[model samples]
Target chain A: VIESNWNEIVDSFDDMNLSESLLRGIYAYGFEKPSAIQQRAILPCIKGYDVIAQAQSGTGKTATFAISILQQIELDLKATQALVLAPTRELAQQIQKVVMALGDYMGASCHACIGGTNVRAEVQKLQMEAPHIIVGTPGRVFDMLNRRYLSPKYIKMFVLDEADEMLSRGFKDQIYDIFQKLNSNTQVVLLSATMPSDVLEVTKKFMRDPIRILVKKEELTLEGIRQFYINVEREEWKLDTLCDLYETLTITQAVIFINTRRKVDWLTEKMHARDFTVSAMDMDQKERDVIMREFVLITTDLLARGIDVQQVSLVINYDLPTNRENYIHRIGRGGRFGRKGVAINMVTEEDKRTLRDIETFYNTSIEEMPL
Target chain B: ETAFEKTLTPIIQEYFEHGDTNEVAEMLRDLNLGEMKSGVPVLAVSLALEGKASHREMTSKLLSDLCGTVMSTNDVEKSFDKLLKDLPELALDTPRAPQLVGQFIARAVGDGILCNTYIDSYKDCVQARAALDKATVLLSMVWGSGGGQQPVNHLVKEIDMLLKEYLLSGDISEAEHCLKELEVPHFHHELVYEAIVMVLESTGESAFKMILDLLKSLWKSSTITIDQMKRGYERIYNEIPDINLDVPHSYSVLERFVEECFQAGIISKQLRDLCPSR
Candidate 1:
């Protein structure tokens, strides 16, 4: 198990042996330096080794793996040489967008094969075009693999984004099923903000002498985001508390995460009745795309992991997440890539225990919201 | 009642607006302050104490510009000695009069316009002692405890390395700690200067974001004061044309970077608006 240190860091993207076209795409994308994780993890992963990397959210983990995969993919093969499995449709799609953007100058093609669309059309595209990269959720990806629509022969790299959430959500079976179809030598990489004991156990079982890049649990929360909680005292008062903070929310874009879709609907309606500019994340990809551009978004934990909206400076946890790791991802939405942010948790009496657990688990202090 | 009060007041006021040091020095020479030569620095320092930081800086520059041409070392020394005697009255109008005057003294010593022995002579006076300690701290911030031996380029390279190493490790507190150990809050503009230059020279967005992150941390912690940060940006803004020569897109990059700085609260809306974009 190799642990990445500063000594292994590459100073810039140009020094990483990346192709000329990929380098052009990277600069055009406004990247002037490789991030900490990118500097340390990209080269090892590109060298065709199994890797397990964990860093704080919004630290360019996606680009770390995306750059490596794009560098290693054979552009002329016209086969899916890389596969990325994310926990949700949005994350998978987001990863696909990153891959395509970073590989734009290389003329690389990437397709998101996820649930909630025409599977027949996806199957036809996969058969006819054979994109160089496949980014999809495990269920749909495994479905494609099981149905012989996605060939596993050419997949040289397999990536699991938000690997801890994926395993804890019981996607391990589909992940294993899909893994069993790939070639024996296919390199595996797990990237996430949180790496629990179970995720580490799974990595040992699947990854062979993997290089591990981990952040201490205490340092997992970014310092740029200020965390505060409003004790609304009752479930009924949560919406009123949210409405009170609505003015602050409009300062920059905001995302409110409820634990369930029902509350997202309820809150969305309550907000609309008050004539607030709010949208919910329960729509299809097209509607969600349009809704994401709005000032306020009400969503579930589904959008938590890999959604990178740069202008989102405020994140409100309308309802506390059941899992402690989800707390990190929820507030991680506000501060993306080192910009300052504010996370306000609307806590009821019952949610106090969970909030304290998150605070203790991340070794962070969330103060009471000032009046 | 003296000609110095009536004549030199508006000359200094006009100088503050136009900021032509040569013009101000030439006018002071023409005044032929045969008996009132020492009143020039006193009047300039008094007016600056009532104004903003920019005014204080301009006063410092004007004093340096007049040092050898119009005012002798004895005349400049007598003028500050008079300001020291009037410190109690100056404190009546400006609460931070001592600290602001201390900065003026430090700037004078650093520019070689005022002798270093002037600070040692004030060690016994209560009001001047506090100002002297502040001047010592500011001087040490520039040249270290050894007193004025270290070259500025050495400090610049040290700042460049600190930022480079910070980008590699991505530890904000560690970077902050290293910067604090440098004990150069006065020269933090160098940190800002080098960090933005590094951003311009960088070929990746990660570097740009890392520098922004470091700056935000430095700003929030007050490790680098807002004035120093603003000075750093202003220096870069002044050099945008030369920077654009090697990096053709330097102007737009600087405009975008400065806007991000404003968005990150590392700068002000006024400063952001003041940034010229071609």
Candidate 2:
């Protein structure tokens, strides 16, 4: 499915065939030059081609799909023409906001169909004025489709944002079930920072002959990320180690990543007990969406991408990612757009291979923590 | 719940909505300068000074409003007496305390608030200005205590002259030195605005690099927001006549400045609204 990389390199928004209304909104959103990913992917998506695009987080990837969806939406029609499925509700809601903002000129109608919000109210709104786009989590989208509150026939595009995460074990079945109901010929686009083999394997069945656009892993590597690791002998030392580095961790906005929800809570409890001021996200969508302006956020990969907390200058991997790709995307959270950032990994003996894999893939050195 | 909302809120809101300087002064009066919230006055004045740089009228007016409020009240003697009583302690705590309060006093003196029936208080006004000048340089640094940092008074004075020289004499080196000395973000918007107008009207290839450099400093500073950036550039772009693209890519310099900041993430999405092509 890899077509020749023969796409025209769109230099600016002025050259794109964007509608005047959409152009106005784009200008208002303040994107002067198209990002590397935006330059490559936006034109193809606008041309009604199915695409699977990959680029690091904070590299304007969301705008790639967002601008595409805005272009595809038939604003005059009152029916949903695009389905943007994010793995988590926070991301889904964020996409909903972005869609409305970029599509401001089109008088764009969009709705967030994430779970935990009133399904009845969603049904009422869906019935009253059909949204041109439905940005939703898997279960809520499936539930809405089941209740027949949302009709799928008119959905011209199906975008699996963070496609790798959605196709993971947690939400794979629901995604496939959602896929079965979509129009078989519906144009499908998958976007992610890292598209592992398994996720790519399943995309073939759901997607058409897709043009693949890969922003090279090396090209996407954030040069500003200074990677370092602390050797911890025991798991309990992880919390103590984090506490020790609190001063460095909090010079600016910092994020601590753990592996599980249970560990996240445990770490949060331990930190609170020590009177260490830190905030942890345990997948509460409401709190995630709230403006937690200034603090160190502790969580797993839930915050790995697309949440624009521009101040995050440090990422402490309290628990390292099991895979090399997650490591890239996790550290990718920091050093946004030419700013300097530092990422610290607390590694036990068993996780050395995962660390090695990451180092090798990026062809970079991971330094030992300085005293 | 009481004094803030009932009296001051309506006055401040009206000033913000309708650009009325008089109302802003009244709003400060409601705050009752007699109480003398030490840090509160400094913050208001600093924000107001900051507003002069960013072209946000509301920010500077907030400062003027505070001073006006203190002046506009009928019990002028009572207010000054209470302020004099609180002055030493506040000055000891914050060195710049004198300058901000001094500015308020100076503004009050000029406004005729203290001029009528209070001409004798001129001695007290001079005392306040002196205290402010002494304290201004001794004020704590923005980040931490440090040297090489000039007082706000000196910087403001320098910018006033630098802008005047550039606007009147059209001296490119004067503009260059002025931009360099303007390391701090609080230079007046009128100073920068006039400097820009001079730069735009300037002839030949020599001014292009200087203009670009000046624009760069403005873009990087926190004193100006993206809205301010867009407005300033839009104004410059509209005012510059018979744009010469032939002289070594100077026509694209403004776009380059905006694009550079965008890439470095210095300029936020707020700047994207500046898309009026030349």
Candidate 3:
């Protein structure tokens, strides 16, 4: 059962009854007040209630759970008192940063045991550092749990950031395995922009009367992103329009999201031929990190979710996503944390229907670029 | 259907491209318009309605140039009367035709090309009422109560230039100095309003950050007071519906600006939360 009647809401960091060190860290991390989700959900999670919070992207959901975990942590014990599982390694690392930043004054330690790193090194670090918090993707964390490298007996809290994506991405089994390994009394908190029925079903199996804080789908569109579309008249005209917008792209950083990896390669080659500086997302962590430095990044939807770059002021949808939910995540790459951003869509005659569907679904207007 | 339209269309287009009111008036005086002289203002304005902003301003100037010499005040009044009748059809192609027509009428009355009585004649007419109200508001803006003084317009342009220069140089001190030179501390609300609009129309993140930095510096120095800043943001909030028509991302940009102000301590947390986010 999910309870929806929790009326507690905090106005400021001071009102939340946080420790002196944690409060100092919050201010140092540049948060003046609690976001809507943070105000309602943080206290419940800190009070040891299982929470399922549904909020739009960039609403400080990470901080909500991170602050809660940091508050409840036993700094002197040094065992993993909290575990956070994100869908992607980048997201996992991002959560780890937030935790470390928010816990900076508390001397809180967190290890990002993501995939693509050496397992021996991860085990050695886990034993040597004995971080109070573990943030990792489902596969690596489950692997560590199975090998006894990550002891789950002391984990008092479990958090799944981007819970919907984790379930939809086929991490359900691994997530369940990790959950089973943790202490049965551990608190669970799921935070996502969406909560599909499948995700809800999985929640019932593990969560014990979780407190639900959800935002409706119609309200999911972010307020800080200005959405516009340019009708290129034909598919072939997209490249010309994109090239015309190259100067606009360099104003800050920009991300060009294509639909497939093949198109990513083709676009990268064409842009290179035109003597444009651009990079594409790769499988390796080193290449991806280097790709972040470029002014223009061309990639598929792989970089869409849980990747926060504060300087990205523009997002271009070279090809509309196959799903409506992906549209939100794609444009969400820009306008992070209530910052100003723009998302331009390259719409062909055939793609107009998809654009209109997305507009209607979100109940937000996406105007045509005025000539 | 009239032969005057073909000849007059290119004249207006040429005038828009190379703006010379006297040249346009000279070319108009050369045209053989026996009975169609009254149609010139209507034709020029109609052509401008289909064009850009500069075209409209140029059309207004050309009408002022031709008022006493080439065309009589009566001819211009008759032209506007015809336009009032054709406004519904004009709006079919241009949704903002009423507002543009109002501006032209206001400019005409201000330049003495149209008599004040011409405005009173359209008082009860349903179709011309909105345009008349718009014209009345603009005339008041130009000549508030007693005399012909337009400080608001001059101040808006000055604020726009200050913001543009600030964005170009990315210099906070220079921006502060220029704003201080304006000596309109009470009217710094206009500065806040113009800066936010500049951010909306700007393309890059550097411009956005530069504007925020300038605003932060101004607030810290008390160059722009809290009340003036709030008033400026409130003015933008009220005009957002109209601003959204031209810059579709205006609502989002305003929300971001307000949030930035709150975070910078330029605006209060109360104002930030009270701001509508849609």
lDDT (C-alpha, whole model) for all candidates: 0.75, 0.61, 0.75
lDDT of 3 at A10: 80
| lDDT (10s digit) by residue, model 2, range A176-252 | 88889988778888877676876777667776677788764555565777889889978867788787788554454
Per-residue lDDT for A82 in model 2?
A: 91
Give the per-residue lDDT digits (tens) of candidate 3, residues B60-158.
Answer: 878887888788778987899888888888888888888779878988888988888678776544556767766765554321111112256676666
lDDT of candidate model 1 versus the reference:
0.75
TM-score of chain B of each: 0.53, 0.41, 0.54
True contacts kept of 1: 0.00
Q: lDDT tens digits, residues B1-86, model 2? A: 34534544444444444566666665465655454333333333333333332223343344435544454344443454445555
Candidate 2's error at A139, in angstroms?
A: 1.8
Candidate 1 lDDT by residue in tens digits, A5-57: 43376898988889999999888765888887887889889998888887664
- The first chain of model 2 has a TM-score of 0.62
Clashing pairs in 2: A30-B272, B28-B69, B29-B69, B48-B60, B98-B132, B99-B132
Which parts of model 3 are misplaced by more than 4 Å? A1-3, A56-59, A192-202, A215-217, A220-371, B1-278
